[PDB]
Amino acid sequence: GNKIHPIGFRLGITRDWESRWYAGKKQYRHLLLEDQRIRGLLEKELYSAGLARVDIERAADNVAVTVHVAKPGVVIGRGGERIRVLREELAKLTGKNVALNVQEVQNPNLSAPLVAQRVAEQIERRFAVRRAIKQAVQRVMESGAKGAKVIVSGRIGGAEQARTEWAAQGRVPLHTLRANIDYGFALARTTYGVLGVKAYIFLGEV
Amino acid sequence: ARRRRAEVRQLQPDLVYGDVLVTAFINKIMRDGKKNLAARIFYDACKIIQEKTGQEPLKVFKQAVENVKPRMEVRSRRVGGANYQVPMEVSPRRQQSLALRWLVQAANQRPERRAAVRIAHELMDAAEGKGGAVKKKEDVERMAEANRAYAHYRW
């Protein structure tokens, strides 16, 4: 058990926070829990949408919430009778009456969180873990990218003895603080246990 | 020192005499990094030599050191059996370190209650050719030579 989160490790450089708002030793923790409550439902609901991310900005009872997804349409709803019920949830929790944008993702094959979700999915439908991975890396690596890697945890194939499946292409230099490597995890639940899935995508250096 | 041959540290010259050999001696006296208290001690001990003696302290100091320098010492070694104390010459660098160390060590074993009083009397006895310092120095050379039988083990 070594190596740090490639994100927390790059927050300074090539990677910004999922919440960029100021506060003080009396506010912060509150505006904090809020975001957690936010993504709470968002991730419980917009799963099918393709919940690639949930950014949250602030100013004063104002909150950005630029929820990114691969299939924006699934957010909107019948004409828009959902992104009306979602904006509804906003004040349902915190009566801040804020925005709630939506931004499609330019190729969900470069969105590690998704790339991992995909793989996590397949694993639950009882797919071939190894191929699923061979393929994933391929897609991700296919639609551009300079490198990629995927890692499913243990109990592969329902095995009684946990293992750790690989697969990786191109470059995925982690020790290089400036690679800009998307990272995504996916907790693939299952009938015999849990299977962690991690995805990394290397794109552009300097 | 497995890679390189550690270069001897180069210390500044004595604030007063400008002698590096003295700064050394001071550092040895120093304990808990109180170079002041140290430096002080030494100097007051240099004055106690001005009175109780004739010549300037530096002269005595130099002489004292020069008498405590062992020109031979025994160093243990393992050889099919036990540990055979092998006599070998003592380098110039170590010759000094051992002298200054032994001075302070012998010095602080003295009965006089004042630090400076002890250093001065030891330097004096040392410069004269007596005192625990010179003793050890002789004790070593006694060990050495007296084990010449093993001398053919050199290093």
């Binding site: - | 604030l15 170079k35 002041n36 430096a39 002080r40 100097y43």
Partner: protein, 127 residues
């Protein structure tokens, strides 16, 4: 008229002003022997002047804040030597061989975790 040179050491800055005249050194107002009341050290801080036979040529107004008197002492060593080179650049050719020009970089090593003091590692039982 006047000459200046900063000078820093082990985290302590010093303002040095060399003005022709006797040699009265006013560190934080007080006289040299005032601020450095019985510290065999001090003296050194004036070694840059003696290095060029001066000393009895300039009076010196000095300020200092940060660290400890010995640190401050060293800083001065730099200042007095720094200002002295400005005053006359031909003085660098003499203070370099003695290195009063260099800024002693030795600082305090950070206190690492796991260890007791940066390097002093905790002891352990029969391993």
């Amino acid at each position: 008229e006047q000459y200046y040179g900063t000078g820093r050491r082990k985290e302590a800055v010093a303002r040095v002003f060399l003005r022709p005249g006797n040699g009265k050194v006013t560190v934080n107002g007080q006289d040299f022997n005032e601020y450095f009341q019985g510290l065999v050290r001090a003296v050194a801080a004036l070694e840059p002047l003696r290095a060029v036979d001066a000393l009895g040529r300039f009076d010196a107004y000095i300020t200092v804040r940060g660290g400890g008197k010995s640190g401050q002492i060293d800083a001065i060593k730099l200042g007095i030597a720094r200002a002295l080179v400005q005053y006359n650049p031909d003085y660098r050719a003499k203070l370099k061989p003695l290195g009063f020009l260099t800024r002693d970089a030795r600082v305090v090593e950070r206190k690492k975790y796991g260890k007791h003091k940066a390097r002093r590692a905790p002891q352990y039982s029969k391993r």
